[PDB]
Every structure is written in C-alpha cells, then in structure tokens.
Amino acid sequence: HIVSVHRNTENNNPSIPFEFSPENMKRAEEVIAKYPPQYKKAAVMPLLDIGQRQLGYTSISVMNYVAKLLEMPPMRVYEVATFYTMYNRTPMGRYHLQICTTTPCQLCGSDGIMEAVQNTLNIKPGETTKDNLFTLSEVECLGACVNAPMMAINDDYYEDLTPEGTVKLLEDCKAGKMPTPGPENHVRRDCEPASGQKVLLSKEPHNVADFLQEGI
Amino acid sequence: AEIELTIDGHKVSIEAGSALIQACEKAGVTVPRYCYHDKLAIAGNCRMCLVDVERAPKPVASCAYPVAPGMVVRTDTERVKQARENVMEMMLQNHPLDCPVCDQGGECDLQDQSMRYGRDRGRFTEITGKRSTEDKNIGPLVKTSMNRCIHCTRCVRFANDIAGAPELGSSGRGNDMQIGTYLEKNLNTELSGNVIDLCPVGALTNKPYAFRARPWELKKTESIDVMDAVGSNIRIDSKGVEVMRVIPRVHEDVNEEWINDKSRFACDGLKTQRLTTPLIRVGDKFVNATWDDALSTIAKAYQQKAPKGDEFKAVAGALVEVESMVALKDMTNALGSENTTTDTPNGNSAPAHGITFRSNYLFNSSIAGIEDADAILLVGTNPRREAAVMNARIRKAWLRQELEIASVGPTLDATFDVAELGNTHADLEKALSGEFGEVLKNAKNPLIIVGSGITDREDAGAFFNTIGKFVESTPSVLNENWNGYNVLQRSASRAGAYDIGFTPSDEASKTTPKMVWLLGADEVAASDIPADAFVVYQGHNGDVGAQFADVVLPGAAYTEKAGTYVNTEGRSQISRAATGPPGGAREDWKILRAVSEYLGVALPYEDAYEVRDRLAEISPSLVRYDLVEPTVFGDVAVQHSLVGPNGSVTPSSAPLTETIENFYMTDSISRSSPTMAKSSIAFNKDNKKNQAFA
Numbered sequence: 055h056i057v058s059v060h061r062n063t064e065n066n067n068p069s070i071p072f073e074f075s076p077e078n079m080k081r082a083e084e085v086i087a088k089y090p091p092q093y094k095k096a097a098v099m100p101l102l103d104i105g106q107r108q109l110g111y112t113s114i115s116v117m118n119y120v121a122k123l124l125e126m127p128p129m130r131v132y133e134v135a136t137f138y139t140m141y142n143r144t145p146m147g148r149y150h151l152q153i154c155t156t157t158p159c160q161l162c163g164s165d166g167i168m169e170a171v172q173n174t175l176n177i178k179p180g181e182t183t184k185d186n187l188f189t190l191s192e193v194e195c196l197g198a199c200v201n202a203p204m205m206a207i208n209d210d211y212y213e214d215l216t217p218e219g220t221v222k223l224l225e226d227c228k229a230g231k232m233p234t235p236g237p238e239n240h241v242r243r244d245c246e247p248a249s250g251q252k253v254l255l256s257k258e259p260h261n262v263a264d265f266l267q268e269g270i
Numbered sequence: 271a272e273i274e275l276t277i278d279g280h281k282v283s284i285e286a287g288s289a290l291i292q293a294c295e296k297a298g299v300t301v302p303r304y305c306y307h308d309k310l311a312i313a314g315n316c317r318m319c320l321v322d323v324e325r326a327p328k329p330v331a332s333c334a335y336p337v338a339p340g341m342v343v344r345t346d347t348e349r350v351k352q353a354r355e356n357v358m359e360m361m362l363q364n365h366p367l368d369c370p371v372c373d374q375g376g377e378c379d380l381q382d383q384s385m386r387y388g389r390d391r392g393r394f395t396e397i398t399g400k401r402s403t404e405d406k407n408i409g410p411l412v413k414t415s416m417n418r419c420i421h422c423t424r425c426v427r428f429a430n431d432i433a434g435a436p437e438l439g440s441s442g443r444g445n446d447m448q449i450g451t452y453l454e455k456n457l458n459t460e461l462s463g464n465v466i467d468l469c470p471v472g473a474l475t476n477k478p479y480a481f482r483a484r485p486w487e488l489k490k491t492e493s494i495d496v497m498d499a500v501g502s503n504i505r506i507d508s509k510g511v512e513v514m515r516v517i518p519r520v521h522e523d524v525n526e527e528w529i530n531d532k533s534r535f536a537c538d539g540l541k542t543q544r545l546t547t548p549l550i551r552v553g554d555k556f557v558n559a560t561w562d563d564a565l566s567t568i569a570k571a572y573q574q575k576a577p578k579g580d581e582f583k584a585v586a587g588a589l590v591e592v593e594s595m596v597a598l599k600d601m602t603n604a605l606g607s608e609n610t611t612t613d614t615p616n617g618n619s620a621p622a623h624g625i626t627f628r629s630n631y632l633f634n635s636s637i638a639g640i641e642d643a644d645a646i647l648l649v650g651t652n653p654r655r656e657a658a659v660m661n662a663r664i665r666k667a668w669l670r671q672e673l674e675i676a677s678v679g680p681t682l683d684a685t686f687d688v689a690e691l692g693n694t695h696a697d698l699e700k701a702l703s704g705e706f707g708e709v710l711k712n713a714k715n716p717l718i719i720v721g722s723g724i725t726d727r728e729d730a731g732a733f734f735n736t737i738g739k740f741v742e743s744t745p746s747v748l749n750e751n752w753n754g755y756n757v758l759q760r761s762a763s764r765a766g767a768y769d770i771g772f773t774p775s776d777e778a779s780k781t782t783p784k785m786v787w788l789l790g791a792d793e794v795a796a797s798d799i800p801a802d803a804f805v806v807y808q809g810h811n812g813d814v815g816a817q818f819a820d821v822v823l824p825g826a827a828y829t830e831k832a833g834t835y836v837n838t839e840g841r842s843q844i845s846r847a848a849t850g851p852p853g854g855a856r857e858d859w860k861i862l863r864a865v866s867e868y869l870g871v872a873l874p875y876e877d878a879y880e881v882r883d884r885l886a887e888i889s890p891s892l893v894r895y896d897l898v899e900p901t902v903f904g905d906v907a908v909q910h911s912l913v914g915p916n917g918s919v920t921p922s923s924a925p926l927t928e929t930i931e932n933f934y935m936t937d938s939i940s941r942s943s944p945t946m947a948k949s950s951i952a953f954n955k956d957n958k959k960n961q962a963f964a
C-alpha cells in the first residue's frame with residue numbers, strides 16, 4: 055500500500071518554514087552543478103534526500119522549498135516524492151528497520167527475523183514504537199541476497215541474520231553502541247562462501263600489464 | 271514530404287514522422303483510443319491502439335509508432351482483436367459499476383468500445399474486490415468520482431500544456447496511483463471545463479449539470495458563443511424549454527475544441543432573474559404590464575417629451591445581435607437622431623481608431639495567425655480574461671516556436687513568459703523606439719495586439735497614433751502579405767456595431783439626452799443617464815439596466831434566437847435557436863419594429879429575409895457567414911484613421927488599468943449565474959487553494 059494524498063496537520067503543513075542549513079546549501083549547490091544549468095530540476099531527488107536527512111522526513115515544506123529552489127511547480131516535486139519509496143512522508147523513528155521478505159530471504163529465514171522483531175518491539179510493519187526508536191517496514195530485495203536473511207537499520211546493512219542476533223542487535227541499538235555492518239558475528243566477510251574462499255587464494259594479484267596484446 | 275503506406279490493403283499518404291493513428295484516420299480506418307487526443311501530446315498508456323505491423327514482432331501502439339515508407343499495417347486480425355479484448359478486461363477489472371449513477375452514461379467511450387472491441391462478460395470475481403479511490407475537491411465546477419479514473423492522463427496533459435495549470439498531476443505509484451492535487455487545491459483556470467470533455471469516463475464531470483439529464487434526451491443545436499468576441503462555436507444541449515449545458519465545437523480557426531468557463535457555466539443564468547413580462551415604473555415599484563400598454567407608454571413619453579434631434583439616445587450593450595442594433599439605428603435615425611452609442615466608459619464619443627475601415631477595429635492577423643507569430647506586443651490587454659482561448663493559442667505557439675512576447679500594461683499572471691516593460695504611454699513609446707521595436711522590425715510575422723480598454727480611455731488617440739506611426743513606419747508589421755495591427759475586442763457586439771456604423775456624432779456627443787433606449791446595456795453607471803430622462807431597457811435578464819428603467823421590454827437571449835454575431839477577426843457567424851423565449855418575451859428586432867410603428871415612423875422590413883437584405887445593404891460581410899475577408903486598404907486605414915485625427919491628443923500619465931476586474935461576472939447572464947458567483951468567491955487569488963507556494 056502506498057499513500058498518495060496529503061492531509062494537513064499542525065506539524066506537517068506548508069505554513070511550517072524550512073530552510074537548508076549553510077552546510078546543506080553548499081552541498082545542494084554542488085549537487086545542482088552536476089547537471090546542465092537549464093535542467094536543474096534533475097537535482098530534485100538528491101536535494102529532497104538532503105532535506106529528508108536534515109529534517110527526519112520528507113514534509114510538504116521540504117517539497118515546496120525544493121520547488122522554489124529549482125523553479126519547478128510544487129506538484130512535479132510531489133509526484134517525485136510520492137513515486138520513490140525511500141522518501142518517508144510520515145515522521146520516523148531514530149532507527150528505520152527494513153527487513154526483506156522476498157523469496158531468497160524467505161527461503162533462508164526472513165520470517166523468523168520478522169517474528170523476532172515484532173515480538174521484541176511489539177509492533178507491526180508500518181508502525182512506530184512508543185519510544186520513537188524503531189519504525190518497521192517490510193521491503194523488497196535490497197541487493198544482499200547472497201548474505202541472506204538480511205536487514206537494514208538507517209542506511210547500513212546487517213546480513214546473514216538469526217533471530218537471536220537480531221534480538222540482541224535491537225537491544226544494543228536501543229541502548230549503547232551498535233555493531234558495525236556486514237555479516238552477523240563475522241561468520242563471513244562478504245560474498246565469499248562461509249566455509250571459505252574457493253577461488254582467489256593468492257597474496258599478490260595478476261597484473262594485466264603482463265598479459266597485454268601484441269598491439270597497443 | 272508525404273510518403274506512401276498500406277493500411278488494411280488501402281494505400282494512403284501523409285507527411286513523414288506522423289503517427290500511425292493519423293494515417294488510419296486519413297484512410298478511414300477506425301482505431302480505438304482513450305489516451306490519444308489530436309490536440310494533446312502523445313501518451314501511450316491505454317494500450318488500446320495496438321495494431322500489427324509486418325516489421326515488428328509484437329503489436330505496436332498506433333498513437334506513438336512513427337509512420338514509415340512501405341510499412342504494412344493490419345487492424346483486423348486475431349492478435350489485434352485479442353489484444354483489445356485483453357486490454358478492456360484489465361481496464362474494467364477495477365472499474366466501478368456506476369453506470370446508472372454516472373453522468374457520462376450514453377456518451378462514454380468506455381461503454382461503446384467495450385461493446386465493440388471487448389468481451390461480452392467479465393471473468394473478474396475476486397472476493398477481495400475492486401480498488402477504491404477517494405474523491406478530490408478541485409473546485410465548484412468539476413465534480414470528481416475518481417473510482418472511475420482509467421489513468422489516461424488527458425486532464426494532466428491539458429492542464430499543464432494547453433492551460434498552464436501545473437497543479438494537477440499523477441501522485442503515487444502503481445495500482446495506488448491517483449490523479450489529483452497531492453494536497454487539497456483548486457484547478458484554478460478559466461479553461462477548466464474542457465477537462466470535463468476530455469475525460470472519456472465520468473471521473474471529472476459538470477457539477478451544476480451533475481444529474482440533470484441524459485444525452486439521448488437532448489436536442490443538439492450548433493450555435494455561437496457570446497460572452498467574448500472570439501465567437502467560439504458551441505453545441506447547446508436542450509431539454510424542452512430548459513438549456514442544460516453548453517459544450518464546445520470544432521473550429522480550428524476560432525477556438526480549436528475549447529471554450530472558457532464563462533461560456534460553459536453561465537448557462538445557469540438563462541433560467542433565473544429573467545424578464546418574462548413588460549414592466550412599467552409607477553414610482554418606487556415596477557408594475558407588470560402588457561405589450562400594448564408598454565409601447566403606448568413609450569409613445570406617450572416620446573410625444574410628451576418632444577426630444578429634438580440628438581436628444582434620443584440609443585445604447586447597445588454586450589451580447590446583442592446585429593439585427594437588433596440595425597433596427598435600433600434605423601429607428602433612431604428615422605426619429606432624427608445620430609446618438610447611437612455603446613455602453614463602454616467613453617461610448618458617448620466615437621472610437622479613436624475610427625470605423626471607416628474595418629482594419630482599424632479588428633484582429634487582422636487572424637486567430638490562426640498567432641500560430642505564425644514570431645513576436646507579440648500586448649498593449650493594454652490581458653488575453654487570459656479577454657479571449658482566453660486566444661491566450662491558449664498564444665501559449666501553444668510559444669511552446670513550439672521562437673516567440674518573444676512583450677506587454678505594456680498591468681503586470682499580468684500569464685500562461686507564458688511575457689517580458690513586462692511598462693504600464694504607461696511613455697513606456698510604450700520607449701519600447702517601440704528602443705529594443706522591442708527592433709525585435710518587431712526584424713520579425714517576419716509580428717503582432718501588435720491592442721486592447722479595447724485602450725479605446726475606453728480619453729487619451730486613446732495618443733496610443734493609436736503612436737501604434738499607427740510605428741506600423742506605417744515598419745514594413746514587417748504591415749505588408750501586402752501580412753497585417754500585424756490587431757485590436758482585441760472583449761464583447762461580442764462591438765465589431766458588428768462598428769461594422770454597421772453604430773457610433774455617435776460629435777454633435778450628439780455633447781447633447782444631454784431626453785430619452786435613452788438602452789439595449790442589453792447593463793454597464794451603465796447611473797451618471798450617463800439623466801435623472802429626468804425617459805429610459806427603456808430591452809434585454810433578457812434584470813441585473814443593472816432594468817433597475818434604472820422606466821419601461822422594461824423583455825427580449826430573447828442568444829439561446830432563443832438565430833442572430834448574426836461578428837467576432838474579433840471580422841468573422842460573421844449565425845446562431846441557431848435552441849428554444850423559444852420565455853413567457854411574453856419576443857425577438858428584439860420585432861420589438862423595435864413594433865415600437866417604431868407605435869411611434870411616428872416604421873421600419874421597411876417585416877420578416878427575417880428583409881432584415882437579412884437590410885444587413886446586406888449595410889455591410890455585405892454580415893451575410894458571408896464564417897468567411898474571414900482580407901482587406902486591400904491597410905495602408906490607407908492606418909494613414910487615415912489612426913495617425914491623422916489623433917495627433918492633437920496629449921497622453922495622460924495615469925497607469926493602464928486592467929479592463930475586466932473579474933473574469934467571472936462580466937455580463938447580465940453571468941452576473942445572474944449562481945455558478946459564476948461561487949466561482950468568483952472561489953478562484954480568488956487571496957484563497958489558499960488557488961496559490962501554490964512555489
């Protein structure tokens with residue numbers, strides 16, 4: 055389900071002001087420079103993300119400020135912010151849990167992870183806790199299907215999951231330092247087989263300079 | 271250059287780069303469609319135009335696939351029929367069973383193309399049901415039932431390309447994609463009603479007409495649009511004595527499938543505050559009276575008062591025929607008067623541009639010539655409120671051509687980039703002998719569009735003298751192939767008025783009138799008519815002029831008579847009666863003939879043929895219907911009427927003011943409309959729904 059209508063609230067309505075900080079305004083000008091001068095509307099996506107990172111969610115005021123910056127009507131920006139699902143148009147928690155439930159992570163155990171998270175936080179996908187700490191959302195494949203099952207907490211991928219590890223991961227993200235991303239408990243590095251690498255076993259690579267053609 | 275191709279065995283030829291659907295239309299081959307429109311950009315989302323091309327493996331979209339030489343198309347075979355069936359299956363998957371409660375029933379493309387190119391029964395029986403979609407509030411004119419949306423994108427394309435209203439769009443993604451304003455906003459434009467006609471389903475409908483009638487109940491009369499001097503061609507749909515709706519009609523040289531919102535929605539005023547019986551003022555009250563008694567009272571007033579010469583004043587307003595004005599002028603002259611007058615602010619004096627040559631008060635670079643334009647200057651005109659369809663044409667030209675547009679006047683919220691450069695006559699001369707003057711000189715089709723609000727000024731000679739000098743000095747504005755001096759009229763009767771010579775003497779300009787016959791004249795101010803004068807209002811709605819009157823004669827509206835109307839171009843168009851007038855109302859030239867006979871005179875014509883012959887005797891262009899004539903006297907006209915007698919006038923420094931302070935509520939029929947009242951409360955720039963904070 056995707057929400058495609060806005061109803062004004064006291065904390066999300068166009069009367070609320072918004073302005074990029076000087077840091078983010080410098081970054082936004084650098085972003086506008088990455089496209090032709092007359093096609094500055096192409097920067098609507100990155101600048102909207104800049105706004106969504108300054109203020110924790112893509113509010114209507116952010117869309118209207120971007121529209122003012124890029125000289126485009128606000129509706130063209132509303133369409134972008136509604137099309138792309140990473141623009142959170144409702145307010146969010148500190149940590150946005152994104153659990154993949156596509157077929158690979160399902161075959162390897164995403165539903166145990168979902169059960170564990172729902173039981174720990176007492177929450178359903180699309181809802182937020184009383185703590186404004188965890189917002190839950192079941193997402194499609196996030197591009198870590200070999201290191202499955204998987205999840206993502208606020209832009210960082212925690213992979214090759216177990217219910218145990220997910221529970222205590224949520225525990226330490228609730229309080230204290232959160233572990234570094236990657237596979238759980240370093241049972242793997244990256245896409246290598248977990249028994250170990252079977253392919254790339256040297257300690258110095260082959261330089262292609264040694265294998266060039268007869269020409270060049 | 272044309273190419274040749276084959277469609278269902280028939281060889282046809284069109285230009286290269288054209289769409290296949292255009293070839294099929296030229297070949298007489300019928301191809302389905304929901305998202306294609308001849309005037310909108312090509313979208314290929316309905317997937318209903320699919321046809322088979324030998325080149326391509328899959329079936330291709332006729333709307334988008336370019337035409338190529340030697341291509342062979344089939345619109346007949348089993349793949350195409352199965353494709354159409356499948357597409358209609360999916361289209362009617364989530365469509366609501368609203369056909370009884372839908373106002374598009376009987377005139378729905380979905381119904382007809384399901385019957386023709388689709389299945390007999392559906393196979394959708396899912397227990398989870400159909401999709402639902404909430405209704406939007408986009409204003410008091412367009413009613414929304416958005417479960418019926420089939421996501422064609424005609425509304426969006428129209429509003430963003432032809433109208434300049436980018437508030438409508440396509441929010442969401444997938445099956446939950448919803449057309450509308452993402453937040454509650456109004457579709458603020460003077461062209462919004464064409465969205466109702468463009469939607470092939472009933473997702474956007476007329477609100478005042480919401481459930482009034484069905485299409486088969488309606489008589490369809492092809493007539494002409496008063497409410498502007500564009501002369502938009504319209505279809506009046508009538509159910510007996512009641513006019514139910516007005517919709518546009520195809521005329522590519524006038525209005526091109528569109529009409530504005532006044533023309534569409536002021537029909538509500540023809541059934542309220544109408545004049546159905548004559549009235550006599552006995553005091554502070556109006557007393558209903560007969561026709562014999564009212565005309566007797568008028569004759570007794572003429573004989574009691576004894577108005578000598580130019581003391582009889584004839585005022586003609588907007589929305590009046592040519593026949594009525596001709597009869598009123600013949601009567602007024604038979605009574606010894608030359609005080610024929612318009613209801614404009616400076617109507618008591620003749621126009622500064624003169625009426626000697628028709629080129630001086632017409633749109634000489636005809637409405638199809640805006641498409642030829644390279645440079646435009648707008649002097650004292652907001653084309654969005656005066657001839658909005660011509661503003662749409664200007665936009666259309668600006669979007670596909672190098673077109674540089676300037677304006678001298680009030681700063682106008684335009685549907686194009688307009689390059690504002692002043693509000694005074696000083697700035698006009700500055701512009702014309704500075705930069706934009708050379709822009710006009712180097713152009714191959716330049717246009718100087720002057721407004722009628724310039725004629726409604728005292729220092730109008732100053733303007734018209736300046737523009738005339740620039741025209742006769744610059745060849746590009748006036749050649750033997752192109753005239754760029756254009757005067758945009760805002761009311762439908764002024765061109766016919768000036769064509770027949772419905773202007774006053776200067777002897778009459780300074781007379782104080784003793785009798786004032788005011789015909790459809792609702793813009794009078796209570797200062798232009800003396801307190802001791804006998805006044806006779808002749809019209810169809812009681813708004814302003816009938817309050818003043820001492821005698822009121824009910825007339826016929828444009829939906830109740832077959833009249834001749836001259837537009838800005840000089841195009842004479844003939845209307846057609848959809849109904850008869852209400853009650854004891856009459857045709858207006860017949861009223862003037864009767865009151866002539868009651869007075870000491872009599873007009874020499876007795877039926878409509880003799881009136882047509884009199885029109886021919888006055889100006890033969892009034893019977894060459896729908897023909898826009900060239901003129902051989904452009905040089906002569908600019909030298910005689912605009913430049914000659916206007917050097918004596920000195921300019922003011924009063925800034926130019928906007929002419930139409932409210933696009934809605936401009937005339938009697940609109941000021942008697944409640945729909946226009948709602949659309950005036952709404953669609954006000956001070957409201958939050960009508961301004962997007964960009």
Ligand code: SF4
Nearest residue numbers: 368369372378471472
């Ligand atoms: S849009 Fe057409 S098919 Fe759909 S409910 Fe209305 S009349 Fe029926």
Ligand code: SF4
Nearest residue numbers: 419420422423425469
């Ligand atoms: S609202 Fe009507 S015109 Fe607009 S896309 Fe939907 S069906 Fe088409």
Ligand code: FES
Nearest residue numbers: 154156159195199
């Ligand atoms: S299937 Fe879960 S990361 Fe792709």
Ligand code: FES
Nearest residue numbers: 314316317319333
């Ligand atoms: S008419 Fe071609 S896809 Fe709609």
